[PDB]
């Protein structure tokens, strides 16, 4: 009675019909217009479960697989719960898909029982309807399209990384790894006023997107020493380096490419250890900083989009319908290194 | 004439007689009373040269090996140069032994041509007399003995690490490795208001000195998991951890022993790589911070000494004469783990 994409087991995401969820007193029913593919969705497709509860129920959702998937979405309010006064039918909204013990207060991205809508349960954007509590809503300005709204959440991970960093207007930066996440970091750096952004990337398609976003390409295959090159063109190093590859050798380079008191922000996911040179941190009084999730960031993202940043013209590379999610969505992400963000339409 | 201790080659420090230096217009001649052993001095004895210029002259000293050794010293002004107005004969002084391109301005400890008095040249405290420029002098308050003055420089290394950290009054800290440097950090932590300081140390003599300075002993041989113990006695981890062992496994533990947004300050020396878990930094939004030398710190140290911190009663464990420097000094640092700081008297 509602078409949805549910995760049942690894490599087993089904496009099935499930019952429309009832709008409970605290909630608001959204008819989804667009939803993106996180790459976390890609990671649970190929090698889950990681964030999807399967063995024990998730503490806050209290639900196990199968779960509907999809954060990074926007849509139109079609029905309003019992206690809701800040949203009427017809309102255009986006969702900050974080479940936390005490709500969106304090450091909710680091809450012990934290979970994601579309991963831990509570609905998902790869469906026609999702019923979320109004504490997770943001009004979509009329200037911004629904597709722009579907880009709010993934832009937030990038912007929260840049805002969390020592970066100031006019400073120089480096992004190591310019996949979909690294590219969003480049756009966020330009919003924050970064000038020279040194993008270290091998793939020509990804090099040609980073250059469109305003970065300088440092091809590891065309330079003898990447760290020496960034040091030469900056006179001692960039002010902030962003590690997005998850490669141990590259984490070393990111630290070595910062100047006196520079900062290395780790954005990538790590499963195994990595050998660093702690001397490189001590010699120049450097700093390494961890970043996960985001918090108190959606208004800033929404405001920057009204100014042209995080444009869907630059970041959205494909629009698909929910039926074609397996082959035209995940499949395209697996085969085409040129894909940045893919938006999914329920019908 | 003048008796001095010179570094000629590795494991080759000689007690010789050299020329009393001229008091040049900008300089001040100090009759040294006491000088300490940094462990940097010990490291040049066992495996130098490291900071000792040998091949090429040092940029600022313009001086090659051999060199007189010894920073962390105090003494009595016995002759004053042509341009000096802030120091008269008889003044009791201590020396901040940093040579930098632009003097003691900006971040002179990270200056490209940076060098240490007693290592890069320009005299040293293991001699009867030293001729330094007055920008490197600080008046020794009458409350503090000459022995107290000789502790300013090593105290500055410890205090500068603590002040450079996110530590606030009441917070909890952990010190991994309680050798001579770690012990000075514990005393510095108490000055800054650290309450529960978890000292991770195997040596009973060093455990019982750290306990005297106000820390809690975490014996690795008496607990199955060091970080698990520190994590629960703090309810999730300390706020700042100090790594002083230089062992890769311990750097992992220091990072893992910090709480949400915790900070790991590296104080140890590193020559080879070290395997960390970058995931440990990302999950809890942690920070790892490098610290080398010190800057703009001597007045703070001197003031805290007037209040009883960094007391020589607690930190000076042996006083020797310069003649016995090799066997009762360096040898004692290698063989007796109960030694904290050893002071050396010229005659
Ligand atoms: Zn996401
Ligand atoms: Zn020293």
Percentage of helical residues of chain A? 25-40%
What overall geometry of chain A do the principal axes of the alpha carbons give?
Answer: globular
Classify the secondary structure makeup of chain A into a structural class. alpha/beta
Q: What Rg of chain A is obtained from the alpha carbons, in whole angstroms?
A: 20 Å
Q: Name the bound molecules.
A: zinc ion
Largest sheet of chain A: 7 strands, mixed
Number of strands of chain A: 19
State the domain count of chain A: 2
Distance between the termini of chain A: 13 Å
Name the largest protein-protein interface in this structure. Answer: A-B, 30 and 29 residues
How many H/I helical runs of chain A? 11
Strand coverage percent of chain A: 25-35%
Query: Oligomerization state of this entry?
Result: homodimer
- What is the H/E string of chain A? EEEHEEEEEEEHHEHEHEHEHEEHEHHEHE
PDB class: oxidoreductase
Keywords: oxidoreductase
Assembly: dimeric
Entry title: X-ray crystal structure of 2R,3R-butanediol dehydrogenase from Bacillus subtilis
């Amino acid at each position: 009675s509602m078409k949805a994409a549910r995760w049942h087991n690894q490599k087993d995401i089904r496009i099935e019909h499930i019952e429309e969820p009832k709008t409970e007193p605290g909630k608001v029913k959204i008819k989804v217009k667009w939803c993106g593919i996180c790459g976390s969705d890609l990671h649970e497709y190929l090698g889950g479960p990681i964030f999807i509860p399967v063995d024990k129920p998730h503490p806050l959702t209290n639900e196990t697989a199968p779960v509907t998937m999809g954060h990074e979405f926007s849509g139109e309010v079609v029905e309003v719960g019992e206690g809701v006064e800040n949203y009427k039918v017809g309102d255009r909204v986006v969702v900050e898909p974080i479940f936390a013990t005490h709500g969106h207060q304090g450091a909710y991205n680091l809450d012990e029982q934290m979970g994601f809508l579309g991963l831990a349960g509570g609905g998902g954007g790869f469906s026609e309807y999702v019923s979320v509590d109004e504490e997770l809503l943001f009004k979509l300005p009329d200037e911004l399209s629904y597709e722009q709204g579907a880009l709010v959440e993934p832009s937030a991970v990038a912007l929260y990384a840049v805002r969390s960093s020592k970066l100031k207007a006019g400073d120089k930066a480096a992004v190591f790894g310019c996949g979909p996440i690294g590219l969003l970091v480049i756009e966020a750096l330009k919003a924050a006023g970064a000038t020279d952004i040194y993008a270290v990337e091998l793939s020509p398609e990804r090099q040609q997107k980073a250059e469109e976003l305003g970065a300088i390409i440092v091809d590891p295959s065309k330079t003898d020493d990447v760290v020496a090159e960034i040091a030469e063109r900056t006179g001692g190093g960039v002010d902030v380096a962003f590690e997005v590859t998850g490669v141990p050798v590259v984490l070393r380079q990111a630290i070595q490419s910062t100047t006196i008191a520079g900062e290395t922000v780790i954005v990538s996911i790590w499963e195994k250890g990595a050998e660093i040179h702690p001397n490189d941190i001590v010699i120049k009084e450097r700093t390494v900083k961890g970043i996960i999730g985001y918090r108190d960031i959606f208004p800033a993202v929404l405001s920057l989009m009204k100014e042209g940043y995080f444009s869907a013209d630059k970041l959205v590379t494909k629009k698909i319908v929910l039926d074609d999610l397996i082959e035209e969505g995940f499949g395209a992400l697996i085969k085409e290194k040129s894909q940045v963000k893919i938006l999914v339409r329920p019908n």
